[PDB]
Amino acid sequence: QCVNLTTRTQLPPAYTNSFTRGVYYPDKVFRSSVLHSTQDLFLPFFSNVTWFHVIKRFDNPVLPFNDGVYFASIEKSNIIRGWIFGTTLDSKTQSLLIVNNATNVVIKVCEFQFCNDPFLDVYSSANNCTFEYVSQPFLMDLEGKQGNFKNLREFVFKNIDGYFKIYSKHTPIDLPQGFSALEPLVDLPIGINITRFQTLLALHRSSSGWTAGAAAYYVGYLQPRTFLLKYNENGTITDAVDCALD
Amino acid sequence: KCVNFNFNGLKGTGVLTESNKKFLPFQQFGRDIADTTDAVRDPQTLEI
Amino acid sequence: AISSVLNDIFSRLDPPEAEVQIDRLITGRLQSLQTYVTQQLIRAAEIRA
Amino acid sequence: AISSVLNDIFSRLDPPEAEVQIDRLITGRLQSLQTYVTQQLIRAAEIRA
Amino acid sequence: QVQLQQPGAELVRPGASVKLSCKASGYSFTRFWMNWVKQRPGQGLEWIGMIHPSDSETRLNQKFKDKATLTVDKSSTTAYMQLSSPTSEDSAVYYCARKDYDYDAWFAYWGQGTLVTVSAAKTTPPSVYPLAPGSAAQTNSMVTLGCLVKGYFPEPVTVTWNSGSLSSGVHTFPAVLQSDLYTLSSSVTVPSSTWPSETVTCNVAHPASSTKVDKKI
Amino acid sequence: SMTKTSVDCTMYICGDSTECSNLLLQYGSFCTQLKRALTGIAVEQDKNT
Amino acid sequence: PLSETKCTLKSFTVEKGIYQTSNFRVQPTESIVRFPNITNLCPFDEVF
Known part of the structure; x- marks a missing residue:
């Protein structure tokens, strides 16, 4: 709570370069073998995403939400349990906490009291909210796995006109490469001001005696873009051309 | 049969035929290469 | 206009308000044909020579 | 427009409302006049050859 | 409905x-x-x-x-x-x-x-004849009776047992076409307490010609 | 010779709605000239062969 | 169709040749309205 981890310390923002990644379906309308030009907040080609690592060095800074959220992580054992979305990080305003118990993803917009460094092995109490959401049930193993890394989750979080949308894509594969087209998942009509964001961290042990797992995750920022989208006969995006890149 | 359509408030005129194309389950409707509505999802049940 | 569908002008806007917006959409479709047919007459003159 | 006569716009509608309906006809007459100058000049090029 | x-x-x-x-x-x-x-x-x-x-x-x-x-x-x-x-x-x-x-x-x-x-045939009213064994060897405890339905057109014909009194123990047989006519039989098995008490008759209703023939066994 | 095309006034401008064809008759001969110009191209494309 | 030739050309006499008249009109018969079955009423009287 008030005492952070031993591995939690200061680390510079080494950065990598996303290549073709960050392209999603701009609408749900089917289009086949045509060129479609639209304008929305996209992840730009030739950009800088900041390289983060969880393991004796761990960094979890607080970045602003207003430049857009692009999320990519390679992990087998699912160390990241969700995110913390707030403004002044107290119970005086509305805040969003996405948490997963590995069965259902709990999405609640309510008044949430926050400490400096919450742990998961977060909030004392919550009141004055009418919003509760229960997602679809599933089963995932939270234990360790062996072999090559089979899981890549690419999430794009944005707020457009008071509507918070979550785009989900899962594909098998510390530098990612290749092109993938994201799919829509849920639509949340929340409509609150969220300035900054935080992440959640699962801990295991065989305050500072707990040990985080070994994974990595990426975060950059979005920006207005006029991409060109190539459509196949099956209705998927196999190629993406930026309007202003080269 | 050529009849007037009203699909979830959106109108149209045409016939209803079978669909061999695979679509997204979240898709309300879709467009052709000529940018007119060639396909629709039923509001009550999931049908293409 | 707000929408380019002729069924979406009548079913949404007022019947005084739709008759302005239907007349904007027809005039845009008349001027698209004034560019096309004038182009086909000039290419008919180039293919005549 | 409601009336195609320019004297029937000035003798009926309001002077804010008459300036819309007169400008709808002159927009319609100059599109029909520019179409006639375009079609005669293409026939002037065919009679030149 | x-x-x-x-x-x-x-x-x-x-x-x-x-x-x-x-x-x-x-x-x-x-x-x-x-x-x-x-x-x-x-x-x-x-x-x-x-x-x-x-x-x-x-x-x-x-x-x-x-x-x-x-x-x-x-x-x-x-x-x-x-x-x-x-x-x-x-x-x-x-x-x-x-x-x-x-x-x-x-x-x-x-x-x-x-x-x-x-077909070019004309509607023929049915000729119904009873079928009785006439005697008994006393080797069974139940009584078997039947009817004979022949000389009718068109098929099907409605054959009931005592105007549809007995719905159990009955058999309906298909008709055989011979010389533009139809012939079908039917059987019933009743116990020995019923047969002196009740009289089994042949009730055949022809829906085409509207003719009902009542013959007693 | 070139590719002979024909453009309909009703199907291109209107979506087969009753409110579109009522305001189309007030515009009159705008697409009548554009239909007969493309007809006169298609006669002269057969004369070139 | 002799009388349909005079209506498009706007003339009393018809010369020798092929003329274009009109287009096909297929009248719609029925109307299809697809609406999902919801037994819940909206609580607009709470806020009003």
Whole structure:
């Protein structure tokens, strides 16, 4: 709570370069073998995403939400349990906490009291909210796995006109490469001001005696873009051309 | 049969035929290469 | 206009308000044909020579 | 427009409302006049050859 | 409860025209389409045609072109089917069915059935004779009786036991065509307490000629 | 010779709605000239062969 | 169709040649309105 981890310390923002990644379906309308030009907040080609690592060095800074959220992580054992979305990080305003118990993803917009460094092995109490959401049930193993890394989750979080949308894509594969087209998942009509964001961290042990797992995750920022989208006969995006890149 | 359509408030005129194309389950409707509505999802049940 | 569908002008806007917006959409479709047919007459003159 | 006569716009509608309906006809007459100058000049090029 | 109604049997000569009736009730007549199903015994089901009743537009099979003519009546909510010059292979069992369209097309409701016999024969009233053994060897505790139904046209005929009193222990046998006539028998097995108490009679109702023959065993 | 095309006034401008064709008759001969110009191209494309 | 030739050309006499008249009109018969089955009423009387 008030005492952070031993591995939690200061680390510079080494950065990598996303290549073709960050392209999603701009609408749900089917289009086949045509060129479609639209304008929305996209992840730009030739950009800088900041390289983060969880393991004796761990960094979890607080970045602003207003430049857009692009999320990519390679992990087998699912160390990241969700995110913390707030403004002044107290119970005086509305805040969003996405948490997963590995069965259902709990999405609640309510008044949430926050400490400096919450742990998961977060909030004392919550009141004055009418919003509760229960997602679809599933089963995932939270234990360790062996072999090559089979899981890549690419999430794009944005707020457009008071509507918070979550785009989900899962594909098998510390530098990612290749092109993938994201799919829509849920639509949340929340409509609150969220300035900054935080992440959640699962801990295991065989305050500072707990040990985080070994994974990595990426975060950059979005920006207005006029991409060109190539459509196949099956209705998927196999190629993406930026309007202003080269 | 050529009849007037009203699909979830959106109108149209045409016939209803079978669909061999695979679509997204979240898709309300879709467009052709000529940018007119060639396909629709039923509001009550999931049908293409 | 707000929408380019002729069924979406009548079913949404007022019947005084739709008759302005239907007349904007027809005039845009008349001027698209004034560019096309004038182009086909000039290419008919180039293919005549 | 409601009336195609320019004297029937000035003798009926309001002077804010008459300036819309007169400008709808002159927009319609100059599109029909520019179409006639375009079609005669293409026939002037065919009679030149 | 939407139920389609058809008459039982129709009779037509080859070369003439026959008309059938399918009556719909409980639902609006112009909101569905009407299908006609032909059943020949041993071949299976065959598809005649499908008609939109509101537009009066027809869809027909390629083999069945110009044999059938489909018309509807929107005032009486009754669909019709008209056949032109039937043959000896056209004698079959005709059905009508409402097709409810949601995604795939199924057959929701059906009619009572219509058997059309195509032949030049004339309607013959039946000749019913009783069948009695006349004696007993006392080797069984129950009594077997029967009736003999011959010399009638068209098939089917309604054969009941004491105006439908005994619904158990009865057997219905199919008719055999010999010399433009039909012959079928029936059997019953009653216990020995019933037979001196009640008299078993042959009740045969011919629906075509409207003639009921009552013969006692 | 070139590719002979024909443009309909009713199907291109209107979506087969009753409110579109009522305001189309007030515009009159605008697409009558554009239909007969493309007809006069298609006669002269057969004369070139 | 002799009378349909005079209506498009706006003339009393018809010369020798092929003329274009009109287009096909297929009248719609029925109307299809697809609406999902919801037994819940909206609570607009709470806020009003």
